[PDB]
Ligand binder design. Structure first.
Ligand SMILES: O=c1ccn([C@@H]2O[C@H](COP(=O)(O)OP(=O)(O)O)[C@@H](O)[C@H]2O)c(=O)[nH]1
Length: 351
DNA sequence: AAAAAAGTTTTTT
DNA sequence: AAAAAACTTTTTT
């Protein structure tokens, strides 16, 4: 049983980029469940083999991490092209890891055939014909199916909480008490404005000391529907493997998601925050049944409630510590079911 | 020192 | 087979 895992649209080298990091983390957690897996990318490296030096059909399972396939500038992007050529050459079922609602599987050929550089490829080389099974991080498969309505060979859909790999890694550990320098923190990208209203609601004009780290920049928040006066402090992006340490610098860390994530997706940040030294504060709309933690104190409905909750946490170190203890225990409750999680993954990739 | 000019890297869906 | 920003390094006030 030989497994190959690839990222469909980003080069994989180290933990300096999120797409690379997630692909390596996946390679690691799969390896840790006793499976023989190789990451195949553009070049050989510490964690990878090169597309041009391996035969994709020597593998029994091909796993693909979702990605955008947009050709910015209308120029060729080898990460996308080489990955899809690799997929197209494969003659068995492809397992597409759908961790981001914005990144459903899509074919590059239709968007390559009319380019001035189309001559560099052929339909046979890029058009992926093998059956594809979508492994949805979201429990609502109708939403996952809707996102893949325009791709005929996607014949199977199955839910699997892919994002739990963060807590099941062999080197995992909870963050320790950390000196606080912020009231609230949130790390992420702008996501092309898909979550602008929520970001403005909970991170802007709060009167609190808030930091927004990651790709996002203040000048990206210009939608007239969600005005603001005082923005949080924006700092640069950091490596994925340093995120929990960053979250720990704050009293609390925010959990919000895209509309389609509500009561559907449990995201990496849920685990990165829950395991950190920052109290996890979740937008009620994101988890209305409180399935993450059955304690109302971890949920906020709007800006005012967030401000009040944070004020309460700043005022009572006892409450802060009590809540951290609670979220840490809940996290460990899920870590306890690691074997179950591993078995469900194997079943998802037909093993 | 501080501002402008050059050069380089990253982001954009 | 781009353009706009963001981020650095060098040259001028
Ligand atoms: O500087 C940063 C900011 C974010 N992240 C990662 O990016 C994820 C969030 O991605 P996104 O902005 O798409 O938000 P999501 O949809 O996952 O909530 C976080 O959980 C981290 O794993 C990171 O590695 N470095």
């Amino acid at each position: 049983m030989k497994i190959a895992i690839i990222n469909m649209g980003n080069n994989v080298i180290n933990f300096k980029t999120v797409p690379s990091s997630e692909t390596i983390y996946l390679f690691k957690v799969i390896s840790e469940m006793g499976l023989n897996v190789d990451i195949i990318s553009l070049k050989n490296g510490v964690y990878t083999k090169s597309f041009d030096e391996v035969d994709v059909n020597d593998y029994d399972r091909l796993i693909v991490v979702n990605s955008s396939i947009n050709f910015f500038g209308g120029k060729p992007n080898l990460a996308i092209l080489s990955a899809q050529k690799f997929m197209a050459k494969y003659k068995s079922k492809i397992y597409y890891l759908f961790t981001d609602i914005r990144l459903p599987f899509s074919q590059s050929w239709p968007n390559v055939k009319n380019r001035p550089w189309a001559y560099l490829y052929t339909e046979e080389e890029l058009l992926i014909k093998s059956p594809i099974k979508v492994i949805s991080q979201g429990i609502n498969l109708d939403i996952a199916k809707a996102a893949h309505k325009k791709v005929d060979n996607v014949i199977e859909f199955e839910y699997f909480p892919i994002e739990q790999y963060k807590i099941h890694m062999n080197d995992f550990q909870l963050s320790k008490p950390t000196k606080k320098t912020l009231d609230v923190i949130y790390g992420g990208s702008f996501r092309s404005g898909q979550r602008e209203s929520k970001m403005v609601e909970f991170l802007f004009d709060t009167g609190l000391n808030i930091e927004f780290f990651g790709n996002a920049r203040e000048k990206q928040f210009k939608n007239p529907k969600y005005p603001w006066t005082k923005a949080p402090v924006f700092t640069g992006k950091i490596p994925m493997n340093m995120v929990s340490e960053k979250n720990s610098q704050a009293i609390a860390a925010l959990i919000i998601g895209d509309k389609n994530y509500n009561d559907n997706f449990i995201t990496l940040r849920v685990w990165e925050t829950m395991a950190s030294d920052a109290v996890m504060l979740i937008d009620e709309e994101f988890d209305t049944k409180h399935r993450i933690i059955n304690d109302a104190r971890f949920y906020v409905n709007n800006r005012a409630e967030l401000i009040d909750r944070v004020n309460e946490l700043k005022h009572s170190d006892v409450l802060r510590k009590e809540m951290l203890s609670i979220q840490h225990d809940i996290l460990n409750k899920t870590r306890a079911k690691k074997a179950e999680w591993q078995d469900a993954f194997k079943k998802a990739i037909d093993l």
